[PDB]
Amino acid sequence: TTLTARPEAITFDPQQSALIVVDMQNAYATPGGYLDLAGFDVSTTRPVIANIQTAVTAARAAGMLIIWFQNGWDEQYVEAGGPGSPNFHKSNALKTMRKQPQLQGKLLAKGSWDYQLVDELVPQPGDIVLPKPRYSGFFNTPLDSILRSRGIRHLVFTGIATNVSVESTLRDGFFLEYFGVVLEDATHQAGPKFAQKAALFNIETFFGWVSDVETFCDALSP
Amino acid sequence: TTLTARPEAITFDPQQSALIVVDMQNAYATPGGYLDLAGFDVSTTRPVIANIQTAVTAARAAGMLIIWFQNGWDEQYVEAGGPGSPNFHKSNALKTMRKQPQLQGKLLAKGSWDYQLVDELVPQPGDIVLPKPRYSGFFNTPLDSILRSRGIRHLVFTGIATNVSVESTLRDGFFLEYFGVVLEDATHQAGPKFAQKAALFNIETFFGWVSDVETFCDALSP
* DSSP alpha helix (H) spans, chain A: 26-29, 34-37, 46-61, 86-90, 92-99, 143-149, 167-175, 193-202, 213-220
**Contact criterion met (CB < 8 Å) for A191 and B178:** no
Separation between Cα atoms, residue A88 and residue A84, nearest integer Å: 8
Sort out which chain A residues have CB atoms less than 8 A from B143's CB and list them: none
Handedness of CA A68, A71, A77, A79 (dihedral sign): positive
The one-letter amino acid code at B174 reads F
**Total Cβ atoms within 10 A of residue A58:** 19
Separation between Cα atoms, residue A46 and residue A9, nearest integer Å: 28
CB under 8 A, 24+ apart: contacts of A96-105: A96/A34, A96/A37, A96/A38, A100/A37, A103/A37, A105/A75, A105/A76, A105/A77
Q: Are B157 and B188 in contact (CB under 8 A)?
A: no
Q: Are B175 and A134 in contact (CB under 8 A)?
A: yes
Give the residue from A206, A207, A209 with the most B CB atoms within 10 Å of its CB, the best one to mutate.
A206
**Contact criterion met (CB < 8 Å) for B175 and A140:** yes
Q: Are B194 and A198 in contact (CB under 8 A)?
A: yes
| Sheet of B179-188, strands arranged across | B128-132, B65-71, B17-22, B154-160, B179-188, B209-211
Q: What's the burial of B105, exposed, middle or buried (CB within 10 Å: 0-12/13-18/19+)?
A: middle
Q: Looking at the partner chain, which of A134, A174, A198 has a beta carbon nearest the beta carbon of B198? A: A198
- Hey, which residues does A157 pair with through a beta bridge? A20, A182
Q: Looking at the partner chain, which of A163, A164, A206 has a beta carbon nearest the beta carbon of B164? A: A206
Closest by CA to A132, choosing from A69, A176, A67, is A69
Q: Looking at the partner chain, which of B139, B175, B201 has a beta carbon nearest the beta carbon of A191? A: B201
**Contact criterion met (CB < 8 Å) for A177 and B81:** yes
- Specify the 3-state DSSP secondary structure of A85: coil
- Chain center to CA of A57: 17
Q: Are A158 and A21 in contact (CB under 8 A)?
A: yes
Q: Are B156 and B216 in contact (CB under 8 A)?
A: yes
Phi, psi of B87 (to 5 degrees): -60, -35
Phi, psi of B25 (to 5 degrees): -105, 160
Convert B56-66 to b/e letters by CB count within 10 Å (16 or more is b): bebbbebebbb
Separation between Cα atoms, residue A195 and residue A95, nearest integer Å: 21
* Number of domains within chain B: 1
- Specify the 3-state DSSP secondary structure of A66: strand
Interface of B with A (CB under 8 A): 10, 81, 84-87, 89-90, 92, 134-136, 139-140, 163-164, 168, 171-172, 174-180, 190-192, 194-195, 197-199, 201-202, 205-208
Compare all CA atoms of chain A with the CA of B6 and give the residue at the minimum distance.
A90
Handedness of CA A201, A205, A208, A210 (dihedral sign): positive
Q: What is the CATH number of the domain that holds B75?
A: 3.40.50.850
B211: left (phi over 0), alpha (psi -120 to 50) or beta: beta
Cβ contacts of B105 within 8 Å, gap of 6 or more: B75, B76, B97, B112
Q: Give yes or no for a cis peptide into A161 (omega within 30° of 0).
A: yes
Q: Are B64 and B13 in contact (CB under 8 A)?
A: no
Phi, psi of B18 (to 5 degrees): -135, 140
**Contact criterion met (CB < 8 Å) for A90 and B174:** yes
The number of CA neighbours under 13 Å toward the Cβ of B138 is 22
Separation between Cα atoms, residue A186 and residue A169, nearest integer Å: 16
Separation between Cα atoms, residue A158 and residue A68, nearest integer Å: 10
Q: Are A191 and A216 in contact (CB under 8 A)?
A: no
**Contact criterion met (CB < 8 Å) for A180 and B86:** yes
Give the experimental resolution in Å: 1.5
Handedness of CA B210, B214, B216, B218 (dihedral sign): negative
B100: left (phi over 0), alpha (psi -120 to 50) or beta: beta
Q: Looking at the partner chain, which of A90, A140, A178 has a beta carbon nearest the beta carbon of B208? A: A90
CB under 8 A, 24+ apart: contacts of B110-115: B110/B72, B110/B73, B110/B74, B110/B75, B111/B75, B112/B75, B113/B26, B114/B25, B114/B26, B114/B27, B114/B33, B114/B34, B114/B72, B115/B25, B115/B26, B115/B27, B115/B70, B115/B72
- Hey, which residues does A160 pair with through a beta bridge? A188
**Total Cβ atoms within 10 A of residue B11:** 9
Compare all CA atoms of chain B with the CA of A6 and give the residue at the minimum distance.
B90
Separation between Cα atoms, residue B42 and residue B188, nearest integer Å: 8
Domain around B180:
2-221
Q: Are A152 and A18 in contact (CB under 8 A)?
A: yes
Cβ contacts of B47 within 8 Å, gap of 6 or more: B185
Give the residue from B166, B175, B182, B207 with the most A CB atoms within 10 Å of its CB, the best one to mutate.
B175
Helix-, strand-, coil-residue percentages of chain B, each rounded to 5: 40, 20, 40
User: Nearest CA of chain B to the CA of A125: how many Å?
Assistant: 31
Q: Are B20 and B69 in contact (CB under 8 A)?
A: yes
Compare all CA atoms of chain A with the CA of B81 and give the residue at the minimum distance.
A177
